[PDB]
Amino acid sequence: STQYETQGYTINNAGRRLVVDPITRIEGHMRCEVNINDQNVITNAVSCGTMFRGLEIILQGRDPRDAWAFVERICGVCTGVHALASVYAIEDAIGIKVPDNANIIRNIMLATLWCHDHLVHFYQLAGMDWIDVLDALKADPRKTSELAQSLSSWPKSSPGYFFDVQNRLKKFVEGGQLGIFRNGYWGHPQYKLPPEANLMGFAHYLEALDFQREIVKIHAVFGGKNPHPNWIVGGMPCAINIDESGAVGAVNMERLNLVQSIITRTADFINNVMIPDALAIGQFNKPWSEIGTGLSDKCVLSYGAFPDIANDFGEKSLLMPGGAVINGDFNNVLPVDLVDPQQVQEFVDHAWYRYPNDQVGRHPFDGITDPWYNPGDVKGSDTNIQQLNEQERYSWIKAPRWRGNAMEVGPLARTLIAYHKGDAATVESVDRMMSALNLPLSGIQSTLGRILCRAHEAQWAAGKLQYFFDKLMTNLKNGNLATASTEKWEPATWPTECRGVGFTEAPRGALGHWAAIRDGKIDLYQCVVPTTWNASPRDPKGQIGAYEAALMNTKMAIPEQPLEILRTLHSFDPCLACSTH
Amino acid sequence: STQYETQGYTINNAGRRLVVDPITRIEGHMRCEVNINDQNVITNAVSCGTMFRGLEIILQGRDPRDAWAFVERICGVCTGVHALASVYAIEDAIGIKVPDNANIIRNIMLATLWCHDHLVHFYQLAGMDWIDVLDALKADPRKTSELAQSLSSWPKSSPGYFFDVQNRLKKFVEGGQLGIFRNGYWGHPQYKLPPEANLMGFAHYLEALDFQREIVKIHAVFGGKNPHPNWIVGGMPCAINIDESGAVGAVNMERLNLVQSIITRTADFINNVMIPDALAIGQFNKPWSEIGTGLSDKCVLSYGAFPDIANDFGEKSLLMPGGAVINGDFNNVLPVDLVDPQQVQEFVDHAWYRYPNDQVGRHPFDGITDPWYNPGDVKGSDTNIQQLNEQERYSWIKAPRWRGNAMEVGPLARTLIAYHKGDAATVESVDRMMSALNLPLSGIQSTLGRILCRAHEAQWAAGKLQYFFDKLMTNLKNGNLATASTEKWEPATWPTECRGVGFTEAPRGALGHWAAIRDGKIDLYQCVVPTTWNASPRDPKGQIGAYEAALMNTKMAIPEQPLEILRTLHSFDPCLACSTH
Amino acid sequence: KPRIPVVWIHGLECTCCTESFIRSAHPLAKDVILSLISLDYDDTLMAAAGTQAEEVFEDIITQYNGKYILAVEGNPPLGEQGMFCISSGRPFIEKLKRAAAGASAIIAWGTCASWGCVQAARPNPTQATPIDKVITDKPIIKVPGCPPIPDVMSAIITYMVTFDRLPDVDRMGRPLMFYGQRIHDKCYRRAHFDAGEFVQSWDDDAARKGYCLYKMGCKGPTTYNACSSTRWNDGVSFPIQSGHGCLGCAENGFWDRGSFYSRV
Amino acid sequence: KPRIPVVWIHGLECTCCTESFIRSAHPLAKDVILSLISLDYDDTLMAAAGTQAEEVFEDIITQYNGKYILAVEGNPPLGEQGMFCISSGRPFIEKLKRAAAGASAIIAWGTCASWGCVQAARPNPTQATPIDKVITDKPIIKVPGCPPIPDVMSAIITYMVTFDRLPDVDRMGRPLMFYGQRIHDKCYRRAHFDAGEFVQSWDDDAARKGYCLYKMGCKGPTTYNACSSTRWNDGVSFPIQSGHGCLGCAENGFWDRGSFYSRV
Numbered sequence A, B: 001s002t003q004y005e006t007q008g009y010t011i012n013n014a015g016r017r018l019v020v021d022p023i024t025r026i027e028g029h030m031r032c033e034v035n036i037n038d039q040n041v042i043t044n045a046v047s048c049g050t051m052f053r054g055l056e057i058i059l060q061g062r063d064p065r066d067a068w069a070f071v072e073r074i075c076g077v078c079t080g081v082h083a084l085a086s087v088y089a090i091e092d093a094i095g096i097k098v099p100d101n102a103n104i105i106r107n108i109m110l111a112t113l114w115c116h117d118h119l120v121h122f123y124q125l126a127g128m129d130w131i132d133v134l135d136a137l138k139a140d141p142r143k144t145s146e147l148a149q150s151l152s153s154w155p156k157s158s159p160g161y162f163f164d165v166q167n168r169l170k171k172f173v174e175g176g177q178l179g180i181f182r183n184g185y186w187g188h189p190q191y192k193l194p195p196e197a198n199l200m201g202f203a204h205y206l207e208a209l210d211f212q213r214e215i216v217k218i219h220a221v222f223g224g225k226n227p228h229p230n231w232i233v234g235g236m237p238c239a240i241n242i243d244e245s246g247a248v249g250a251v252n253m254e255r256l257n258l259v260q261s262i263i264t265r266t267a268d269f270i271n272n273v274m275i276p277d278a279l280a281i282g283q284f285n286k287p288w289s290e291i292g293t294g295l296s297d298k299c300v301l302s303y304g305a306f307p308d309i310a311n312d313f314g315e316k317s318l319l320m321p322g323g324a325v326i327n328g329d330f331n332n333v334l335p336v337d338l339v340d341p342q343q344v345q346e347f348v349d350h351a352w353y354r355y356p357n358d359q360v361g362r363h364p365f366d367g368i369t370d371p372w373y374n375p376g377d378v379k380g381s382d383t384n385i386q387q388l389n390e391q392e393r394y395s396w397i398k399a400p401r402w403r404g405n406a407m408e409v410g411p412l413a414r415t416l417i418a419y420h421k422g423d424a425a426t427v428e429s430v431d432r433m434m435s436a437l438n439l440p441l442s443g444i445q446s447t448l449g450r451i452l453c454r455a456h457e458a459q460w461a462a463g464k465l466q467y468f469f470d471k472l473m474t475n476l477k478n479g480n481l482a483t484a485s486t487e488k489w490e491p492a493t494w495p496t497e498c499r500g501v502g503f504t505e506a507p508r509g510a511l512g513h514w515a516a517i518r519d520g521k522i523d524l525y526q527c528v529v530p531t532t533w534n535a536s537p538r539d540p541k542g543q544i545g546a547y548e549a550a551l552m553n554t555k556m557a558i559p560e561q562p563l564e565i566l567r568t569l570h571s572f573d574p575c576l577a578c579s580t581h
Numbered sequence C, D: 001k002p003r004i005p006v007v008w009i010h011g012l013e014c015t016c017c018t019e020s021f022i023r024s025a026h027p028l029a030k031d032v033i034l035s036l037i038s039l040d041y042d043d044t045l046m047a048a049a050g051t052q053a054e055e056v057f058e059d060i061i062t063q064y065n066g067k068y069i070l071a072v073e074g075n076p077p078l079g080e081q082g083m084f085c086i087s088s089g090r091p092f093i094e095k096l097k098r099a100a101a102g103a104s105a106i107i108a109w110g111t112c113a114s115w116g117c118v119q120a121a122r123p124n125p126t127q128a129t130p131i132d133k134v135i136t137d138k139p140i141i142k143v144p145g146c147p148p149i150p151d152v153m154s155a156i157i158t159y160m161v162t163f164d165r166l167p168d169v170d171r172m173g174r175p176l177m178f179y180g181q182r183i184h185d186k187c188y189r190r191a192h193f194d195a196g197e198f199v200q201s202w203d204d205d206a207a208r209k210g211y212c213l214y215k216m217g218c219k220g221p222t223t224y225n226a227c228s229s230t231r232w233n234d235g236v237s238f239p240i241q242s243g244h245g246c247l248g249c250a251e252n253g254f255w256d257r258g259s260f261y262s263r264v
């Protein structure tokens, strides 16, 4: 066994080794290993992406106009965000400016995704870490109704409703076919909700499973379908016609009316179901404000998102702020530049890839994706990993760093960046939230805080849907219908050689696509995705990434039941297909 | 003035005359006049249909296969029922037998229309006679929640919901634009609900207005659209394909899944919203179990409906029983024969039509529709009527009689017939309802009872939707897909001269279409519709119809405000376009 | 802010257009009534009856003279001195003329108000006459169909409220947005039409594969509406999708163009 | 009354098919899970992880050997000894084979499981291989699309449950009900194709009237699916309705048939 110091942690691989493979209630394939000491506290954590497809390789030789369609299939959970980053990147390379309506519609697509993805994460992915479903069977329906009514105006609160939900659960489980609840962690001592809260939360799980399908009807209107809507280089393909012959063939007033109806319902669900549930998790799980901090009090990163001024990606345009904090110095939010070769770099000394020199990091314009499965001694064989060898290569995920620093990305990172840049809305919202929980601001830098911030962001995005819709309608009232620029659609109009960067804030954090075009075709296409940052393996300095850091120092009540590991990992909303691409 | 006796009433047109024209919260155009004595009690009532279109005339010379489409436009409220009666009539004339699936789908169409029409009537048409909308502003939201939860398991009952509904209402009327509530009867002494019950009812009015749109998606699947779905002579045009190429062009499993989802939702809304609200109206308005009896303790009529054995319209097949009671003798439910010239006849001595002898009634196969606007010695003039002359011709509605007796039709009539024939489900439902109210069985024979029976029937029909759906699926599992019989589609296959009767129970009561075909064309097409029965004018004996009888002897608190008249008329769900056609 | 006053009157009709309106999926008719317009008179929905309804009518058309929109469903009969349709003891036409005189604009909902519909089909016993043959000095927007599509009705309403203007119309007064193209030029069975793949009798093999309904009498080739694109009842279906040819119900005179089952 | 056991495994994938499933409008995915099947293993949704998830897998496939349905999303990579997709420390293909051996039938959801999809597009770095090239002794129902339509997935499930049998399939293993006809033979823009009325560049006048997308690269003429009839997301839209040509996403090899913007 060995030990070393990094980022204030003591990484010690002595002691019992625990393996969690597969990690469930995530997207894609992950393995996690930890070592625990004699007090059942984690002293080493190992994040491993257990899949790879090679989109960066597949994209070579494609027409740049087609790229969005391929890269959208990086991930069906954060569906759309890679298409958006792609069209941004290709437009940046070629020098294309899209019409205002196209930009507004793209912002609607992104905000729709934030609402959907954050909602489903809260309930379907993370929720069972916090709600003991089986314990709901012990709840009193009338006390459940009282609890729900004390927390929210949401209509669906009758005692008979909670009894009906409970009875449905009872009958589901009574024949022994527990389905997704089989062999869960029910009864673990870290389940702290009372039975009534478990029943309320379970009812809401089901309500969210039903309601989420409606949100994506916005994607169907503008993008044809969800999952995997359509886009174009130069804007969007959803031509608008409000008052002319043939509006039946276009986005017309009826289509826009449908979109508005979804916006209102989405805001109401998030504000009156998810928000009070998130706050209630916080109220009953306050100790988790001190667990899973990781890098969130050290190094956080946002690129920024939602340009409100079409084709302007600067600070005055982006409605979701960008910036970086390092060394715990939240008084100095630093600017990010995605072209600067000294900023974003990826290392592969601990990943299954080949570089000519694995002791150096490569900016994505110099990126290389040459897969090399080389696990070393794993106490089994190349086809039987019993214990990953974290002293050498242990993941399909590359290791991104920013100025050589290991960073956390995602809702909590973004919230901290906006708060510390002095965004007045963010400051007010976060202060009010922490006040309601009677916790200090530092309580947000935690596993609980990640969950709170995600819910915050769903509320913010639902509000921004209405803002963007209203902006589109204003343009239409002024007779501004354009949705595409085609001046540079034809390859004969493009530079013979050019490169560009497309960036945004996906639900899970900072996303970039770097594209080089030569002779009408993609010469290089490199992606650095939010879960690539968070789930990163180590670098030549031995620095650990966000997941490994957040797991460090965590107490486990019952080593064989990894509930505390699941809670912290799930709080980041891992997307392993995204991470590896 | 004059006075005469009929049917146990003293019809006396001395004294003050009141006019209600227009009658609102009905379909179509009606005028009502009454006389009321010094004691504010109605001593005379006059029912006038104030519209006519002449479908029976327009149908002459048409192709019988087209008739359903014309007669469906008799009415958009009970949309579909005239189409059904029409295809039945033409099939009866020609000798066509439809496949089982067509019959089952027709039964689904009819049950879907019962659910929709009865729900909307309860809330949108009759509801404001019972619920004081402005008094809902005085309710306590918590006490409203408690009341709702005491009555039902329906989820939507939180204090915050009722507050939100109340605040929407408060805002609505804040600018002084009261809309449909302007100049209503609010605060009349006959409004007996407490404020919490008014708020509960008003919330449900809005929920029903929203939900009703979903019910008719069943019509859209099988019939293309609602209002006014499509049908064919020989079955239905909605060909079925579950497991073959091209199922995308037909009723397939996805379409059937949509239907099933609507059935479940419809049953749940009726059973948990409409039923408890009907019972609550009863609890708070028990005196109305003794008001508006009219003909319901004397003479009631049902033809019967929902043949479960395809092409068999007999007593062993019809799921909704047929029969007649006269002379108050409910021990003698009599069989109805729609061909017998001595049974159904229409008189016009008090209506705006010509007959060779207006002192006799004509069976519909001998029917004549020769319009003659002749109001006689009115107060006012023929184009400016101040008072109809009920001693002369006073309506566009013909006067149907059964063996010379004036009958009530509709939900109460059907309930009484089924109860007294011993239909177990009807007996159990009625007995439970009347026990819940602590009222005798006779309390159903009243204005309140009409409303209670309507709610019972919505529940009955919702249950039958599932039964019919399951029968359809059983056939499909057995490889029985047929939806049309076409061996007699072409006119050359028809008898040169033939006649038929199509009958059913529309939401408002007994419906018949009588058709004669000659040389490939409609030679005669006569309709007798439920509101024709109920809103009938007098006959040569002076016998009064169901509306006039139910209004007799009614006390009015405030003569100038016709709330008690509206309550009783609306309890029959008048459809004036149906009545006159 | 105050909402725009709307007076909705009913002549000879079946009430299908009113029913269609309340089917709207987006915006819900509830929200139209509560938030978008002020529905100040409507015989189907209003609390007041009789003299109290007459007072509403008179108050609204007086207080909001020149400022209200008049919606009309149905039509006036010219036969029997207009007494085929009587309101407050007088011919309906007098109510129509009084309401029209104060209106800023008129929406003729449905084929009845636009053209005549079923009561005007041969031999037109009542001499039922479309609105624009009686009212000749007001803008009239025709929204035909029997009834028009629910979400077309609500989209037209929202357009007018949002954009503060009447929709642009074709030469017959129909909104271009929904009536500019034929059913047949947006019909999902057109591939079959072009290939000569037709239903020949009900429930044949062609019908079970969704072949074209031309030989069964579909009038889509001559009918302008949105049914094949926007569809009906939250987009669930339309006549042709459920196996029946278009009747032609949005077009003037559709009842008297021959049998629904005769071609073209 | 017990529900049919279902094991849902995931190879190399993007998870769109699982997302599509939960979009089902009728039956809701909730009701499928609670009432129609027993979804006994699914890495995206299940409570258990790690050793507890391994125990569920082993217990179900043993207890229900010969009786469960295997759903597969994604595919196995043959490169690097299968270690491009690792589950419980071992190649995914081992888990696929173990799960297949006990299954009564297999549902290959999506183009990944059916054919290969994006990871199999040139140059196929991982040697991603469709299910039916590895499992050769079991019924395999291919339900292609990237992803398949939500209500197509749920209709296939309910068909199998209700009728107690596999759907009839074409020569490629696709259900005839939804894959028997091409997009282009049920497309509502076919009138425009027939008339030579085409979008020529994005947002041109033709695009604003809903003209055909053939000249913009639509692959509807060679693609079998239900998108132009059943449509997507509760019938709200489909690619062509919202202005983009079909990519061909239900067809084997669609990524490598030339640019999406080059004509059939």
Ligand code: SF4
Binding pocket: C183, C184, C185, C187, C188, C189, C190, C191, C193, C211, C212, C213, C214, C218, C219, C220, C221, C240, C245, C246
């Ligand atoms: S079904 Fe009617 S509208 Fe459609 S293609 Fe055939 S003829 Fe044209």
Ligand code: SF4
Binding pocket: D183, D184, D185, D187, D188, D189, D190, D191, D193, D211, D212, D213, D214, D218, D219, D220, D221, D240, D245, D246
């Ligand atoms: S848009 Fe595509 S599928 Fe539709 S008609 Fe044109 S080429 Fe065919």
Ligand code: FCO
Binding pocket: A075, A078, A081, A082, A506, A507, A508, A509, A511, A529, A530, A531, A532, A574, A575, A578, A579
């Ligand atoms: N959100 C999201 Fe998916 C990840 N990680 C992307 O980009």
Ligand code: FCO
Binding pocket: B075, B078, B081, B082, B506, B507, B508, B509, B511, B529, B530, B531, B532, B574, B575, B578, B579
């Ligand atoms: N119900 C109904 Fe309409 C009437 N009366 C018919 O038939």
Ligand code: SF3
Binding pocket: B073, B076, C013, C014, C015, C016, C017, C018, C073, C074, C109, C110, C111, C112, C113, C117, C118, C145, C146, C147
């Ligand atoms: Fe909506 S009233 Fe119904 S008949 Fe044809 S439009 Fe008229």
Ligand code: SF3
Binding pocket: A073, A076, D013, D014, D015, D016, D017, D018, D073, D074, D109, D110, D111, D112, D113, D117, D118, D145, D146, D147
């Ligand atoms: Fe639903 S996993 Fe998404 S990529 Fe094309 S089908 Fe595969």
Ligand code: F3S
Binding pocket: B225, C145, C146, C183, C223, C224, C225, C227, C228, C238, C239, C240, C245, C246, C247, C248, C249, C250
């Ligand atoms: S009959 Fe009418 S509803 Fe549409 S499809 Fe034809 S215009």
Ligand code: F3S
Binding pocket: A225, D145, D146, D183, D223, D224, D225, D227, D228, D238, D239, D240, D245, D246, D247, D248, D249, D250
């Ligand atoms: S791209 Fe795919 S989703 Fe349908 S329209 Fe074409 S098969």
Ligand SMILES: [Cl-]
Binding pocket: C111, C115, C116, C117, C118, C120, C251, C252, C253, C254, C255
């Ligand atoms: Cl007409």
Ligand SMILES: [Cl-]
Binding pocket: D111, D115, D116, D117, D118, D120, D251, D252, D253, D254, D255
């Ligand atoms: Cl493929």
Ligand SMILES: [Li+]
Binding pocket: A091, A092, A095, A096, A097, A311
């Ligand atoms: Li740019």
Ligand SMILES: [Mg+2]
Binding pocket: A056, A398, A526, A527, A528, A529, A581
């Ligand atoms: Mg990368």
Ligand SMILES: [Mg+2]
Binding pocket: B056, B398, B526, B527, B528, B529, B581
């Ligand atoms: Mg008649």
Ligand code: NI
Binding pocket: A027, A074, A075, A076, A077, A078, A575, A576, A577, A578
């Ligand atoms: Ni993802």
Ligand code: NI
Binding pocket: B027, B074, B075, B076, B077, B078, B575, B576, B577, B578
């Ligand atoms: Ni009617």
